[PDB]
Design a protein around this ligand. Structure first.
Ligand SMILES: C[C@@](CCOc1ccc(Cl)c(F)c1)(C(=O)O)c1ccc(Cl)c(Cl)c1
Length: 134
């Protein structure tokens, strides 16, 4: 109880850096990169007992995942990858690992001041996305 309190709420994207290069590293094709890169998603995070839900709404795609920390689940990503995901809490940071096709990417979500900072890493390439409260 109270594990992710500081994440819960409704958040809006305010900045993005290096996302196109991250998507390239992931394997995302041209047209999806262009439309996905334009998106300005809202992220809605909620907790009910042990179940965390992260919803993302944008003009590109609406997605929703619900999960228990440490417990793998199957996810279809906005770019239509079919991945095996595991999300854990490590020192206050939500760490989301996605596995598919012998590949892996990690998404870390952290509270920093009034922001929620999202770092997406694929091999040597990092993208940083900053969300503020809606
Ligand atoms: C980056 C992220 C979360 C992960 O999401 C990914 C990741 C890869 C790919 Cl290829 C993709 F399309 C989405 C965010 O927290 O900002 C996001 C959310 C929602 C949207 Cl709509 C977009 Cl574009 C990006």
């Amino acid at each position: 109880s109270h594990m992710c309190d500081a994440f819960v709420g409704t958040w809006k994207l305010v900045s993005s850096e290096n996302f196109d290069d991250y998507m390239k590293e992931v394997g995302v094709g041209f047209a999806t990169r262009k439309v996905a890169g334009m998106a300005k998603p809202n992220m809605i995070i909620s907790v009910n007992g042990d179940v965390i839900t992260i919803k993302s709404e944008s003009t590109f795609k609406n997605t929703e995942i619900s999960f228990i920390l440490g417990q793998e689940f199957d996810e279809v990503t906005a770019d239509d990858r079919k991945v095996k995901s595991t999300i854990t809490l490590d020192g206050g940071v939500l760490v989301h690992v996605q596995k598919w096709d012998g590949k892996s990417t990690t998404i870390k979500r952290k509270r920093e001041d009034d922001k929620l900072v999202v770092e997406c890493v694929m091999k040597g390439v990092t993208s940083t996305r900053v969300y503020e409260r809606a």
